[PDB]
């Protein structure tokens, strides 16, 4: 299907401790492939997926410079924002940036994104037309006007529609054996009595990729979107994901409940029953 | 590949 490439950046100011913490991660779909961390020992952008190691020294030099340049921009911006907002020097503040692009199943550009937050709240974002900005507040309006005057949207668009796409497509080819493949959920049901009259049924999905999945409980073939305990999808730690859903049922009525699992790794949706 | 353009706020 479609694919995305996303870069996530977090800068945290650290008064007295000296320099800000800077961490950048890059993803293709739900697979991390690089990282840059100011507190890591390396000082370079480094690989987090085997297929990005196909890239040569020039790629690594270039992407390392980009990470060092971005780091310095956010460090400047942390000082700048403290100034715009008239904040004191003693507290710690955070900038987050996410950017990237989506392509279709045949590599066609679908869209691009660029959004910035300060202290966990929207600051400025490139709109979908990639030709204009939305500023969340009056400080971001200072940023918006100066960015409009220098035609910053054109520069971002050139990136999002150009190298972002070129990069993503190349990663999809080089890493096709993992990125363009799926891992289906491994499933099972557990049963745990609560009392003499009720029992918990928990339907598990393990070892799946990508992260997107739908777990649904039915009773006599009817959706049970009320008495359902449902956890956030979570990383297994090996590049795959886990999720469960549970229902409290009357003891003896277990066979009436079915768990339905939908995942692109499955040729057909799965139905589980105790 | 990342975006090489840096803009101040």
């Amino acid at each position, epitope marked *: 299907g479609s694919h995305s490439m996303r870069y996530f950046f977090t800068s945290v100011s650290r008064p007295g401790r000296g320099e800000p913490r800077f961490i950048a991660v890059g993803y293709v779909d739900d697979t991390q492939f690089v990282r840059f961390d100011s507190d890591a020992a390396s000082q370079k952008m480094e690989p987090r997926a085997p297929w990005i190691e196909q890239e040569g020294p020039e790629y690594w030099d270039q992407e390392t*410079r980009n990470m*060092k*340049a971005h780091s*310095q*921009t956010d*460090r*400047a911006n942390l*000082g*700048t924002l*403290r*100034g*715009y907002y*008239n*904040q004191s*020097e003693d507290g710690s503040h955070t900038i987050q940036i996410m950017y990237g692009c989506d392509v279709g199943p045949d590599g066609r550009f679908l869209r691009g994104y660029r959004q910035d937050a300060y202290d966990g709240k929207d600051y400025i974002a490139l709109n979908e037309d990639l030709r204009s900005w939305t500023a969340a507040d009056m400080a971001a309006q*200072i940023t918006k006007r*100066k960015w409009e005057a*220098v035609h910053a949207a054109e*520069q971002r668009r050139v990136y999002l529609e150009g190298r972002c796409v070129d990069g993503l497509r190349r990663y999809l080819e080089n890493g096709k054996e993992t990125l363009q493949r799926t891992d289906p959920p491994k499933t099972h049901m557990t049963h745990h009595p609560i009392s003499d009259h009720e029992a918990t049924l928990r339907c598990w999905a393990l070892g799946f990729y990508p992260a997107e999945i739908t777990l649904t409980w039915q009773r006599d073939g009817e959706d049970q979107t009320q008495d359902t305990e449902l956890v956030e999808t979570r990383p297994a730690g090996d590049g795959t994901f886990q999720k469960w859903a549970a229902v409290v049922v009357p003891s003896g009525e277990e066979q009436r409940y079915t768990c339905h699992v939908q995942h692109e790794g499955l040729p057909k949706p799965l139905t589980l029953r105790w | 590949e990342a975006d*090489p*353009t*840096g*803009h*101040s*706020y």
Partner: antibody
Framework: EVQLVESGGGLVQPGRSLRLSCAAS????????MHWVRQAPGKGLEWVSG????????GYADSVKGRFTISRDNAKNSLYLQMNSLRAEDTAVYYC???????????????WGQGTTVTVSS | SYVLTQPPSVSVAPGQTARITCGGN??????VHWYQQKPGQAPVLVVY???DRPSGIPERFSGSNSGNMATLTISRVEAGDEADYYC???????????FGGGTDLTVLG
């Protein structure tokens, strides 16, 4: 080791143009922001313009906007200042200076050249 | 226009700690740099980001910055330190680098 060698300075009639050049050596030129800073006779320093490492961002002092243009050739390790519509008050020693980081904003000037003199005179 | 104010002259005795001040509205929220320009010479960066020293600059050059005042401090001042010193900040609201007017440091005697 590190050198920033300015050239192109001279006498220019007001209203005309002059191009200053700065030859950079002994460092990775394209890793750093670069700037022009000037000093009129007997006066203090005035930033003129800056350019980030890859030309991705550029700035100018209000005193020169619309008239001066900063540019760089990272293949030739050179920085330029095209000065148009010169005025008597542009008369100064123009210093080529290295920004201590990738960006023209925020990061101070850690290496300065010896300067080249621009005399805007009738 | 953002303004930085330096006294035009500071006079000192050798061995004292000279102090050159740089006033600015909420200058504490900015990152101060100081330059030393001796007679017949281009400027030299002596302190960056309020308090840091480039490699090669003596430990006796130090800086502070908070509120509406930044200070360059030169301990064990010697005759060689005579120069014009300029403070500087990047101002994002105006998109300008600003310099103070410069302080002429004379070492008397």
């Amino acid at each position: 080791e590190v050198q920033l060698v300015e050239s192109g300075g001279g006498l220019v009639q007001p209203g005309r143009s002059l191009r200053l050049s700065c030859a950079a050596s002994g460092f990775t030129f394209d890793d750093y922001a670069m700037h022009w800073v000037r000093q009129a006779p007997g006066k203090g320093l005035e930033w003129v313009s800056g350019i980030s490492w890859n030309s991705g961002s550029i700035g100018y002092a209000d005193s020169v906007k619309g008239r001066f243009t900063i540019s760089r050739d990272n293949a030739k390790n050179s920085l330029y200042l095209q000065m148009n519509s010169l005025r008597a008050e542009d008369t100064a020693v123009y210093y080529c200076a290295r920004g201590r980081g990738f960006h023209y904003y925020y990061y101070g000037m850690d290496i300065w050249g010896q300067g080249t003199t621009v005399t805007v005179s009738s | 226009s953002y303004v930085l104010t330096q006294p035009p002259s500071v006079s000192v005795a050798p061995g004292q700690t000279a102090r050159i001040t740089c006033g600015g509205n909420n200058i504490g929220s900015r990152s101060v740099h100081w330059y030393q320009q001796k007679p017949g010479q281009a400027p030299v960066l002596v302190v960056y980001d309020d308090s840091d020293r480039p490699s090669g600059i003596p430990e006796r050059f130090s800086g502070s910055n908070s509120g509406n005042m930044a200070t360059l401090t030169i301990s064990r001042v010697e005759a060689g330190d005579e120069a014009d010193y300029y403070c500087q900040v990047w101002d994002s609201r105006t998109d300008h680098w600003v310099f103070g007017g410069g302080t002429d440091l004379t070492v008397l005697g």
